[PDB]
Amino acid sequence: MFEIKKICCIGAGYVGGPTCSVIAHMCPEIRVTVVDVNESRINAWNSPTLPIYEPGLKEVVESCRGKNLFFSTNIDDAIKEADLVFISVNTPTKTYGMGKGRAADLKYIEACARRIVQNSNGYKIVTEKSTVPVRAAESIRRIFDANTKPNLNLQVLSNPEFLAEGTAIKDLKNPDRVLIGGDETPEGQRAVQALCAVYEHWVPREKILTTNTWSSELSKLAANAFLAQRISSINSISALCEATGADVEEVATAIGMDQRIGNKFLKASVGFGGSCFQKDVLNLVYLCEALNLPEVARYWQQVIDMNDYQRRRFASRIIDSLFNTVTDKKIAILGFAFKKDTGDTRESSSIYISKYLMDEGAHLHIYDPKVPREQIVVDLSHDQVSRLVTISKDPYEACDGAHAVVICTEWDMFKELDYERIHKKMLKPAFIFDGRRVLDGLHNELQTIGFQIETIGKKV
């Protein structure tokens, strides 16, 4: 059986950095080198201030860095020396050309495939961790086959990642499962077992699934679609609850106690964000169209359409509640990250809600405990941002003279704010729009203070 002792990971982002840190942590006899074209990002990984915020990550990195974990811009030498090469680069939705707004952009994957074969001799296992369309591994195999050399044997595997940001270290150290796809061939199965042996340093063999490459690729897309669907489903129930006078939290409990349904991922919200759910569902939708499966495409499209509607209707609830006009009105936005326990803003509902209110000419004052002010400015930019956006140092500044407080991210602190103080300095009537249900069981207290408090999944 083949022993992997040098790993190169191309892409030092939210997947590459944490995944490799944990491998290095659990496998002291393997040298793990994380590489990237982004020099500032690599430099930050090698510093006391990491380029991303992830609970527990700093402790894992500092235990290994310089011992068997390395971060470098020297991609070529990392590849050359590696037994196993992870492709962990970004796969954003195409914003141009064929399949604009739907198709996955594979330019970064392709650039990796080309650089690997340019710098490779002998045997390596090339492992696609990035989320890709079904059959993308076949393209990598084709690039490798077309640029073959004597004794070049590059084995291609799929090894999708299932970590959630904010819980990355926990999920990596105790994953519900690890999924690996490869050919049925002897060489394919030898590559698969080599990678299994890495994970078996800390993951039980019973929790490692092996399949073919296509099942692996699809499984990842399908898993995200099912998860995203659970959220769009409970959000659609939230709108029904508001209309009928039921409570989505109480309905969710009754639904969730059916063990066939399960009780996870039933928290209604202003809408799901994050870099992956939207793009991965749209990837699936684009694939179906391309494979003559239009019924399946319109089935999954509804997950996105419902999410977009949830956001849109939350925005219109704000504008309607504020006497149908918010032009020149100060509105506090509490939370910009796409979920708590991350500084990541990619596809955050906070962006979308902010842009809907900016379209009305509202004056937004945005606070988040973890997101850097520079990123907020970038996210809201194409000006409008200079005229309409202020980034606040604390939530009290943001609410000072506000007509409305809009909670978009479920940071623990928002529940604990001094709302009596806030009320005194808000313009009147003062509104709170809770897009996260974090103020449940404070409604009586807030109403006594004098707020009009509105939340998703509860009738006004």
Ligand X SMILES: NC(=O)C1=CN([C@@H]2O[C@H](COP(=O)(O)OP(=O)(O)OC[C@H]3O[C@@H](n4cnc5c(N)ncnc54)[C@H](O)[C@@H]3O)[C@@H](O)[C@H]2O)C=CC1
Ligand Y SMILES: O=c1ccn([C@@H]2O[C@H](COP(=O)(O)OP(=O)(O)O[C@H]3O[C@H](CO)[C@@H](O)[C@H](O)[C@H]3O)[C@@H](O)[C@H]2O)c(=O)[nH]1
Catalytic residue set: 161, 220, 276
**Contact status, residue 362 vs residue 332, Cβ threshold 8 Å:** no
Residue 336, classified by CB atoms within 10 Å of its CB into exposed (0-12), middle (13-18) or buried (19+), is buried
41 binds ligand X (CB under 6 A): yes
Helix (H) or strand (E) holding 407: strand 404-407
Residue 126 and residue 158 in contact, taking contact as beta carbons nearer than 8 Å: no
Instruction: Tell me the angle at which helices 136-146 and 107-118 cross, rounded to the nearest 10 degrees.
Output: 30
Pair of tokens at residue 145:
């086959």
Q: Which stretch binds ligand Y (CB under 6 A): 148-156, 161-169, 370-378, 450-458?
A: 161-169
Binding to its own copies, residues 211-230 (CB under 8 A): 211-212, 214-219, 222-223, 225-227, 229-230
Q: How far is the CB of 431 from ligand X (least distance, A)?
A: 22
90 annotated ligand binder: yes
Radius of gyration of the chain (CA): 24
**Given the rule CB under 6 A, which of 9-17, 136-144, 188-196, 406-414 is the region that contacts ligand X?**
9-17
Q: Which of 20, 50, 112, 172 binds ligand X (CB under 6 A)?
A: 112
**Cα–Cα distance, 314 to 160 (Å, whole number):** 34
Q: Is 293 in the site for its own copies (CB under 8 A)?
A: yes
List the single partner that 413 binds among Cl ion, its own copies, ligand Y, none, CB under 5 to 8 Å by kind. Answer: Cl ion
Largest CA distance in the chain: 79
Min. distance of Cβ 83 from ligand Y in angstroms?
25
DSSP state of 175: -
Q: Are strands 69-72 and 31-35 parallel, antiparallel or unpaired?
A: parallel
221 annotated binding-site participant: yes
Closer by beta carbon to ligand Y, 18 or else 395: 18
What's the Cα-to-Cα distance from 115 to each of 88, 111, 119, rounded to whole Å?
14, 6, 6
Q: What character string, x for contact with its own copies (CB under 8 A) and - otherwise, covers 91-130? A: -----xxx----xxxxx-xx--------------------
Q: Does residue 414 have a known ligand-binding role? A: no
Question: Which one, 81 or 360, has the nearer CB to its own copies?
Answer: 360
227: partner contacted, choices Cl ion, ligand X, ligand Y, none (Cβ within 5-8 A by kind): ligand Y
CA dihedral 92, 148, 38, 366 (to 10 degrees): 10
272 binds ligand Y (CB under 6 A): yes
Q: What is the distance between the alpha carbons of residues 156 and 159, in angstroms, rounded to a whole number?
A: 10
What is the C-alpha to C-alpha distance for residues 418 and 415, in angstroms, rounded to an integer? 9
- Lay out the site mask for ligand Y across 232-271 (x = CB under 6 A, - = otherwise): ---------------------------------xxx-x--
Minimum separation from the CB atom of position 46 to its own copies (A): 29
On whether 48 is known to bind a ligand per the annotation, the reply is: no
Tokens of 421: 């103080």
Site for its own copies contains 232 (CB under 8 A): yes
State the DSSP code for 253: H
Residues forming the annotated binding site?
A: 11-16, 36, 41, 89-93, 130-132, 161-165, 220-224, 260, 267-273, 276-279, 338-339, 346, 436
Q: Which residue ranges make up the site for ligand Y (CB under 6 A)? A: 131, 161-165, 224, 227, 231, 265-267, 269, 272-274, 276-277, 338-339
